[PDB]
Scaffold this active site. Structure first.
Site, PDB file in Angstrom:
ATOM      1  N   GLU A  35       0.826  -1.224   0.000  1.00  8.89           N
ATOM      2  CA  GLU A  35       0.000   0.000   0.000  1.00  8.89           C
ATOM      3  C   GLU A  35       0.866   1.284   0.000  1.00  8.89           C
ATOM      4  OE1 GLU A  35      -3.181   0.379  -0.464  1.00  8.89           O
ATOM      5  OE2 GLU A  35      -3.996  -1.626  -0.294  1.00  8.89           O
ATOM      6  N   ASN A  46      -7.778   9.257  -5.520  1.00 12.76           N
ATOM      7  CA  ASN A  46      -8.598   8.320  -6.325  1.00 12.76           C
ATOM      8  C   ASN A  46      -9.402   9.033  -7.407  1.00 12.76           C
ATOM      9  OD1 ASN A  46      -9.003   6.942  -3.140  1.00 12.76           O
ATOM     10  ND2 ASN A  46      -7.739   6.039  -4.710  1.00 12.76           N
ATOM     11  N   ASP A  48     -12.548   9.088  -7.968  1.00  7.33           N
ATOM     12  CA  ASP A  48     -13.758   9.688  -7.420  1.00  7.33           C
ATOM     13  C   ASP A  48     -13.530  10.965  -6.606  1.00  7.33           C
ATOM     14  OD1 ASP A  48     -12.844   8.892  -4.904  1.00  7.33           O
ATOM     15  OD2 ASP A  48     -14.303   7.340  -4.648  1.00  7.33           O
ATOM     16  N   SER A  50     -11.797  11.113  -3.780  1.00  7.91           N
ATOM     17  CA  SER A  50     -11.334  10.782  -2.441  1.00  7.91           C
ATOM     18  C   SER A  50      -9.783  10.599  -2.448  1.00  7.91           C
ATOM     19  CB  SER A  50     -12.023   9.538  -1.893  1.00  7.91           C
ATOM     20  OG  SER A  50     -11.698   8.447  -2.733  1.00  7.91           O
ATOM     21  N   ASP A  52      -6.378   8.441  -0.401  1.00  7.19           N
ATOM     22  CA  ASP A  52      -5.907   7.431   0.525  1.00  7.19           C
ATOM     23  C   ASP A  52      -4.700   7.957   1.339  1.00  7.19           C
ATOM     24  OD1 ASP A  52      -7.835   5.704  -0.685  1.00  7.19           O
ATOM     25  OD2 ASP A  52      -6.305   4.590  -1.752  1.00  7.19           O
ATOM     26  N   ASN A  59      -8.988   5.380   3.261  1.00  3.45           N
ATOM     27  CA  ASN A  59      -9.636   6.220   2.257  1.00  3.45           C
ATOM     28  C   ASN A  59     -10.572   7.297   2.864  1.00  3.45           C
ATOM     29  OD1 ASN A  59     -12.245   6.381   0.378  1.00  3.45           O
ATOM     30  ND2 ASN A  59     -10.430   6.422  -0.866  1.00  3.45           N
TER      31      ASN A  59
END
Ligand SMILES: [Pt+4]
Ligand SMILES: [Pt+4]
EC number: 3.2.1.17
Length: 129
Positions: A35, A46, A48, A50, A52, A59
């Protein structure tokens, strides 16, 4: 902070992640490796809108507030920036909520694709735990 592999295994173990909801330590170390490459300061945006955050790439759509994800839920009750700290306490506490949500560690896409069903014990091999 960029953790060493065994250093992170030890901090995760101390914070109670070893066998949490049935997932051995090696699973958590593997997920963190893929990750964030063990970097608490990792961020990734991301499609959309959002973002991380941190070692386990938690998220902003669901789990934390970053002030820029319209209709986010903040389920861990935490500014997302708290997830970037050299102290992994906030990330660990939030991850515990995530993995309890019904889908276990499948919530982490890199764990599903790169750790699930592999010999995850290799990630803690040689560590003084
Ligand atoms: Pt530093
Ligand atoms: Pt320590």
């Amino acid at each position: 902070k960029v953790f060493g592999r065994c250093e992170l295994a030890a901090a995760m173990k101390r914070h109670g992640l070893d066998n949490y909801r049935g997932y051995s330590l090696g699973n958590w170390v593997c997920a963190a490796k893929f990750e964030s490459n063990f970097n608490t300061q990792a961020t990734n945006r991301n499609t959309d809108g959002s973002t991380d955050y941190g070692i386990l790439q938690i998220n902003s759509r669901w789990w934390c507030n970053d002030g820029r994800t319209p209709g986010s839920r903040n389920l861990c009750n935490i500014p997302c920036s708290a997830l970037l700290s050299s102290d992994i306490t906030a990330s660990v506490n939030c991850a515990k909520k995530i993995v309890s949500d019904g889908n276990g560690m499948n919530a982490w896409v890199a764990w599903r694709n790169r750790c699930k069903g592999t010999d995850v014990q290799a990630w803690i091999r040689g560590c003084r735990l």
